[PDB]
Amino acid sequence: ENEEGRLIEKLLGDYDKRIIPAKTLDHIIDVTLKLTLTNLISLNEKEEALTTNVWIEIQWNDYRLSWNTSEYEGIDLVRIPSELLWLPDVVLENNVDGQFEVAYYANVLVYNDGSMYWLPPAIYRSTCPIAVTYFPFDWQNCSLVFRSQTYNAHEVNLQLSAEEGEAVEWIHIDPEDFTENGEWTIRHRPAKKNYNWQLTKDDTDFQEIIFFLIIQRKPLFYIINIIAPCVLISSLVVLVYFLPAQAGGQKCTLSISVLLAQTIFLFLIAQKVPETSLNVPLIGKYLIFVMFVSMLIVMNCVIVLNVSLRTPNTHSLSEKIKHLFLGFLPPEIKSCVEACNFIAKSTKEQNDSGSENENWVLIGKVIDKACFWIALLLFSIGTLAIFLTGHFNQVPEFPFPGDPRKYVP
């Protein structure tokens, strides 16, 4: 016969699960927490939520559920459904949804001395305020805040689990069950007991256990798929300085089209970053910079076209301008005779007008070359600087800058 049947009937008989198991008035139940991360499912940027697949290990002592193993044929561990027992209402407070408690209410391992061991699984969605300053070269500092929803520090004493005397101050990671995210690398994973000193040992919010996850984004996907195309397309603006400054040269076409492509890329980025307004993402800063540079290049194309396509009819080529831009930066017989004279004169005048047009075209070309050099320098420096400051965003060496401890097993 299964003696567990009569043992459990004895234990749960005359047992009230609403009563905190305090032996005396001043007894404080010590509740021990330990988080085992099995999968970092995702960090939803749009809603700023970190989803994790964890096993939360909760341990306490319930003196009511203790027995003498000799009276039950050596049974020293039984499994009782958690719905039948008193539990410390340990919940994830910083949850995006309304899910405070665990997902699946597993059984509780009850040992003969009253030790209760509860290890339910959970899919936790917790708020992670996302810093976009260095997107996509960013590292996020996500937190999981655990505290009792019901009992205050005068009743329940939350603590971190300790094995072999040493406290486990980190998110445990079982090698038998763990999967790499593929987009996020877990760099640090400390855990500490925190206090809200604005409160007192009452109010149920005085004490909490915080498990941290300093995760670094892998940017190769973002580089290859967004940044490299964006830089390559933005670099096309500098080509407009080698197109002819006349009808069919298509300087403005190229410039405006590069501007439109950058706008498309801005829309593309808008689908990847959160809609918060605390900072502009690094890639967003680069996009704004290149769009402004392309606007400047459109203006310069318009100006060079205007200069090149000038004529003596509308504009006069000043001698000072010419010097500056070309010296430093770079019966029947009489009627027939009259007809011939006029023909020669008209040809000469047309040729002179053509020569003036040629001078204007040359001035345009010189301006075009100088502005090409300026634009190339500007674009190269901007790109290099922005993505170098992106590449120099290291994850801090220590989980907490003040502490000298590494918080690793």
Partner 1 sequence: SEHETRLVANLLENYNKVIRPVEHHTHFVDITVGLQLIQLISVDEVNQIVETNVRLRQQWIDVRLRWNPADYGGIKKIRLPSDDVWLPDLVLYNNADGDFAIVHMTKLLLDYTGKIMWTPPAIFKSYCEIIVTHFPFDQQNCTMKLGIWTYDGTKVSISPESDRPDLSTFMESGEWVMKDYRGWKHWVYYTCCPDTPYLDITYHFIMQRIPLYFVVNVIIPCLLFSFLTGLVFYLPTDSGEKMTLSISVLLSLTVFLLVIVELIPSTSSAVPLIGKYMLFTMIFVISSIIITVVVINTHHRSPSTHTMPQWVRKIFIDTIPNVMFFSTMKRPDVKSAIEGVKYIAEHMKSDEESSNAAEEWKYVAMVIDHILLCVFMLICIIGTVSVFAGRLIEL
39 binds partner 1 (CB under 8 A): yes
What does the chain come to in residues? 409
* Options 187-195, 277-285, 371-379, 381-389: segment touching partner 1 (CB under 8 A): 277-285
Residue of 301, 297, 320 lying closest to 376 (CA atoms): 297
Answer yes or no whether residue 275 interacts with partner 1 by CB under 8 A. yes
| Closer of 113 and 180 to partner 1 (Cβ) | 180
Find the binding residues for partner 1 in span 185-244 (CB under 8 A).
196, 198, 205, 218-222, 224-226, 228-229, 232-233, 235-236, 239, 242-244
**What are the structure tokens assigned to 300, written together?**
């310069």
Shortest distance, position 5 Cβ to partner 1, whole Å? 4
Which residue from 28, 113, 162, 306 is in contact with partner 1, where contact means CB under 8 A?
A: 306
Binding mask 325-364 toward partner 1 (x if CB under 8 A, else -) reads -------xx-xxxxxxxxxxxxxx--x------x--xx--
Residue the block writes with tokens 């005048």 = 349
| Amino acid found at 38 | T
User: Quick one: 94 or 140, whose CB is closer to partner 1?
Assistant: 94
Question: Which x/- pattern over 2-31 shows residues binding partner 1 (rule: CB under 8 A)?
Answer: xxxx--xx--x---x-xxxxxxxx------
Q: Does 88 bind partner 1 (CB under 8 A)?
A: no
Helix or strand holding residue 167 (H, E): strand 166-167
By DSSP bridging, strand 156-160 and strand 29-44 are: parallel
Closest approach, Cβ 389 to partner 1, in A, equals: 18
Instruction: Please list every residue from 387 through 406 that binds partner 1, using CB under 8 A.
Output: none
| Nearer Cβ to partner 1 (103/403) | 103
Which bin fits 84, alpha (ψ -120 to 50), beta or left (φ > 0)?
Answer: alpha
Cis peptide before 190 (omega within 30 of 0): no
Alpha-carbon distance values, 358 to 244, 312, 346 (Å):
13, 11, 19
Closest by CA to 382, choosing from 264, 282, 269, is 282
Task: Identify which of residues 331 and 404 has a Cβ nearer to partner 1 in the complex.
Answer: 331
CB of 13 to partner 1, least distance (A): 11
Strand partners, 115: 61
- Token readout for 175 is 């090698």
- Binding of partner 1 at residue 162 (CB under 8 A)? no
- List binders of partner 1 among 95-134 (CB under 8 A): 96-98, 100, 103-104, 106-107, 109, 119, 121, 123, 127, 129
CB under 8 A, 24+ apart: contacts of 239-242:
240/297, 240/301, 241/368, 241/369, 241/371, 241/372, 241/375, 242/372
Q: What is the spatial distance between Cα 208 and Cα 188, in angstroms, rounded to a whole number?
A: 20
**Which residues between 243 and 272 bind partner 1 (CB under 8 A)?**
243-244, 246-254, 256-257, 259-261, 263-268, 270-271
Please, which residue, 22 or 408, has the CB nearer to partner 1?
22
Positive or negative, the CA dihedral 314, 317, 321, 324 is positive
Which one of 71, 113, 174, 352 is in contact with partner 1 (CB under 8 A)?
Answer: 174
With the C-alpha atoms ordered 309, 315, 316, 318, is the resulting torsion angle positive or negative? negative
Interface pick for partner 1 out of 33, 65, 80, 237 (rule CB under 8 A):
80
CB nearer to partner 1: pick between 200 and 263: 263
Contacts of 182 (CB under 8 A, 6+ apart): 218
Q: Which is nearer to partner 1, 47 or 374 (CB)?
A: 47
How far, rounded to the nearest angstrom, does the alpha carbon of residue 384 sit from its chain's CA centroid? 21
With contact defined as beta carbons under 8 Å apart, do 96 and 47 qualify? yes
Shortest Cβ 39–partner 1 spacing (Å): 6
Which one of 75-83, 208-216, 381-389, 400-408 is the stretch in contact with partner 1 (CB under 8 A)?
75-83
The yes or no reply on residue 167 touching partner 1 (CB under 8 A) is no
